[PDB]
Amino acid sequence: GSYPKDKFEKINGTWYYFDSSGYMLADRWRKHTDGNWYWFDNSGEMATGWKKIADKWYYFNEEGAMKTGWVKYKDTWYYLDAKEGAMVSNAFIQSADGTGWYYLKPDGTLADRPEFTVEPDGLITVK
Amino acid sequence: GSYPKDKFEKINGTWYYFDSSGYMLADRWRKHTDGNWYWFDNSGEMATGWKKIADKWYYFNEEGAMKTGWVKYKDTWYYLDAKEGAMVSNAFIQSADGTGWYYLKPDGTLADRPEFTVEPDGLITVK
Ligand SMILES: CCCCCCCCCC[N+](C)(C)[O-]
Ligand SMILES: CCCCCCCCCC[N+](C)(C)[O-]
Ligand SMILES: C[N+](C)(C)CCO
Ligand SMILES: C[N+](C)(C)CCO
Ligand SMILES: C[N+](C)(C)CCO
Ligand SMILES: C[N+](C)(C)CCO
Ligand SMILES: C[N+](C)(C)CCO
Numbered sequence: 001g002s003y004p005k006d007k008f009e010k011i012n013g014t015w016y017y018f019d020s021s022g023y024m025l026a027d028r029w030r031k032h033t034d035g036n037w038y039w040f041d042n043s044g045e046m047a048t049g050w051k052k053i054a055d056k057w058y059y060f061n062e063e064g065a066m067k068t069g070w071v072k073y074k075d076t077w078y079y080l081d082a083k084e085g086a087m088v089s090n091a092f093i094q095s096a097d098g099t100g101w102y103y104l105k106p107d108g109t110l111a112d113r114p115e116f117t118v119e120p121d122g123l124i125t126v127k
Numbered sequence: 128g129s130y131p132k133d134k135f136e137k138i139n140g141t142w143y144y145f146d147s148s149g150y151m152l153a154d155r156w157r158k159h160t161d162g163n164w165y166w167f168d169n170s171g172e173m174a175t176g177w178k179k180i181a182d183k184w185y186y187f188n189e190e191g192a193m194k195t196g197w198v199k200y201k202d203t204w205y206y207l208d209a210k211e212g213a214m215v216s217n218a219f220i221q222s223a224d225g226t227g228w229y230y231l232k233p234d235g236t237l238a239d240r241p242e243f244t245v246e247p248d249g250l251i252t253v254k
Contacts, residue, residue, distance in 0.1 A: 100246070120239070125227035
């Protein structure tokens with residue numbers, strides 16, 4: 001009624017989330033009742049789009065839900081850890097059919113045309 | 128001690144282990160006070176070298192201690208998971224100097240001469 005508690009609330013046209021004492025969360029994560037994780041920056045505003053928390057990138061949809069799995073941002077694929085959420089970079093992510101792998105460049109972007117180089121001991125270098 | 132209670136035992140040549148309850152260990156793992164993981168087959172014999180436990184491969188030093196990381200067996204390189212100790216297969220383990228990767232074949236052997244096929248979308252197939 002007069003004391004928002006553990007809930008979302010759109011104040012002044014901005015989404016915030018109040019703890020059990022009526023304070024807005026700030027620089028904190030909150031797993032909502034819908035199953036999604038949400039993040040609120042220093043001003044307490046619900047994160048939308050890309051945000052870098054504790055030196056790891058995460059992608060939230062327009063509704064504020066942190067996404068996981070493959071997503072396409074500006075027509076270029078990315079991969080967010082299926083469990084933790086963070087953007088995977090410089091890694092090979094197994095395809096769904098388990099047939100192959102996809103390589104995400106050092107900057108998280110997918111390599112549609114990866115170039116490999118092999119050294120006599122087998123060390124594979126990608127580019 | 129009038130009866131062995133939880134400890135090793137070098138019965139002439141071979142080592143064995145009895146639980147606190149007195150009984151001997153067989154077909155059971157045991158993380159000791161040395162941090163090292165140990166295993167004893169159905170005849171309580173302390174594993175040494177290579178062993179296929181529950182359909183997975185592991186390697187212990189000449190002292191029953193389970194080791195992890197790269198290990199060689201007859202001109203062939205294998206990688207042992209640093210957490211489970213199990214043999215990794217059809218996986219890319221990153222080099223220690225971060226410059227590149229080593230691909231292990233499904234059969235668990237290192238691919239020193241890997242061959243790659245990059246599909247239109249960027250899918251990568253390894254041989
Ligand atoms: C419901 C909030 C409980 C706070 C603990 C948040 C721990 C960080 C884990 C969240 N996450 C995996 C998405 O990064
Ligand atoms: C009793 C209310 C049940 C809570 C459901 C609240 C709707 C989800 C919040 C929408 N959102 C902040 C994510 O945009
Ligand atoms: C580097 N990122 C792609 C994560 C930021 C886009 O604004
Ligand atoms: C796979 N190798 C054994 C060649 C690399 C460890 O140095
Ligand atoms: C042979 N032992 C395993 C008992 C010695 C290792 O410290
Ligand atoms: C397979 N082990 C039990 C040895 C690993 C536990 O982390
Ligand atoms: C699996 N993906 C759809 C992300 C790759 C095709 O570009």
